[PDB]
Structures are given as structure tokens and as C-alpha cells.
């Protein structure tokens with residue numbers, strides 16, 4: 001692949017049919033840009049494009065490829081960021097996906113401190129739905145957090161970074177990702193659908209605090225100490241005891257006692273209808 005990538009006609013888009021635009025996100029994952037895609041027939045679509053950065057290595061290429069390939073296998077769902085196309089031939093790899101014009105869910109919630117209680121349970125249900133789908137495709141996310149949910153022009157929640165190939169590293173918004181990780185994942189390094197369920201619990205807390213910061217000011221060592229003590233975040237103001245018991249059920253120390261995403265979806269669907 002350092003000389004040429006394998007061909008896949010079902011997904012290939014001609015480079016003359018894609019016009020790259022402004023940045024949407026940089027990282028050591030490469031970079032993502034806004035782009036305009038012509039006929040994914042003469043239809044113009046705003047899309048997001050992920051590509052390597054100019055200092056990427058051969059291993060970064062093969063990680064980008066394997067993410068594209070995982071998105072092919074996983075298939076389409078309304079509440080995930082979907083693969084639309086790719087330029088793999090005669091030039092840098094471009095992985096072309098759905099664009100979310102309203103940012104990540106954290107940003108979306110914070111700018112709107114406007115959402116009804118129904119809207120909030122609805123965000124939770126859309127995210128559980130995306131997760132139920134991914135889990136059914138054997139995909140374990142490993143960093144489910146509001147930062148990794150993107151929101152579209154029409155307010156659809158879409159999990160991002162699920163196809164992806166250091167406890168002290170902070171995100172762009174200086175928060176520590178270990179604050180979303182299940183204890184089995186953090187301590188014993190066991191990653192399952194049920195450790196993603198614990199992360200969903202933290203994500204529910206983010207939702208009902210309108211994009212609050214878990215454990216503000218707590219460094220990695222102290223968080224270990226809290227999880228060891230069976231500490232659990234306080235119920236946020238404006239959050240029914242039932243939604244809090246759902247968070248607390250996601251935070252069960254024993255994974256098989258956490259609900260599943262399928263149970264989460266059934267409960268949230270019921271909760272939305274009554275809210």
C-alpha cells in the first residue's frame with residue numbers, strides 16, 4: 001500500500017468530483033476537512049474527508065485503511081457517521097464520510113444552556129440506538145463520550161470514531177478520557193460492549209448536565225482512588241431519579257449486571273414517550 005492501494009469500485013470517487021475545503025479537525029489521526037462531493041447524480045453534497053497529514057508514516061496509512069475497511073463491514077445506520085466514498089487511487093487516501101454541521105454533542109449542549117427535557121432524553125436514545133447497532137456489528141467503541149457524538153444540521157446524533165484502529169493525555173478541551181472508562185477496562189484492560197455501557201452512563205451524565213465536565217479537577221491518581229472506593233457521581237439537578245438509576249445501573253461494578261444497549265434502547269424509548 002506504500003506504492004498503491006487495492007481498488008474497490010463500489011466506493012471509489014473520482015478526484016475531479018471532490019473539492020476539499022476548510023479544516024474540521026486535526027489530530028495524530030491525520031486531519032479532517034469539509035468538502036463538496038459531486039454525485040455520490042450531478043447532486044452536490046457537503047461531506048467530511050479524513051486523510052493523512054504530511055508527516056504520517058506507513059503504519060498511519062494502514063490504520064486509516066483499516067478504519068475505512070471497518071466502516072465498510074459495519075454498514076449504514078442513521079445514528080453513526082457513515083462511510084460515503086473514498087479516493088484510494090493515484091494520490092493520497094481520502095475517506096469520505098457524512099458531515100455534522102452542529103459540532104460534537106458537548107458543544108451542542110453547552111451552546112444551548114434551547115433543549116426540552118424530551119430533547120435530552122431523545123439525545124440519549126439516539127446515542128443508545130447507534131451503540132446498539134454498533135454492538136450488533138461487533139464494534140466496541142472504547143471512548144464513547146459526548147465529544148465523540150456529532151450532531152447534524154437536522155439534529156441527528158451520530159457516533160464518530162467507532163472504526164478506529166496513556167492515562168495522562170488530555171483531550172482538546174483539557175479533560176481526561178479515563179473519566180469515561182469502565183473499571184474493568186481501566187484496571188484489568190477488559191473492553192466489552194458492557195464497558196462501553198459504563199461509558200454511556202458518563203455520557204448520560206454529560207447530557208443531563210448540559211455538557212458538564214466529569215470529576216472536574218481530579219487527576220488520574222485520584223480518579224483511580226475514587227473508582228476503587230466505589231464512588232459514583234452525584235445525581236445532576238434536573239434529572240429524574242429514573243434517569244439517575246439508569247446511570248447508576250450503567251455504573252454497576254459488575255459488567256453483566258449493567259444493562260445492555262438493547263435494554264438501554266427499550267427503556268429510553270419508553271422514557272422518551274412519557275417525558
Ligand SMILES: Nc1ncc2c(n1)-c1ccccc1[C@H](c1ccccc1)C2
Nearest residue numbers: 024025032048050081098099100160161
Ligand atoms: N463536523 C464534522 N462532521 C463530520 C465528521 C467530523 N466533523 C470529524 C471531525 C474530526 C474527526 C472525525 C470526524 C468524523 C469522522 C467519523 C468517523 C470517521 C472519520 C471521520 C466526521
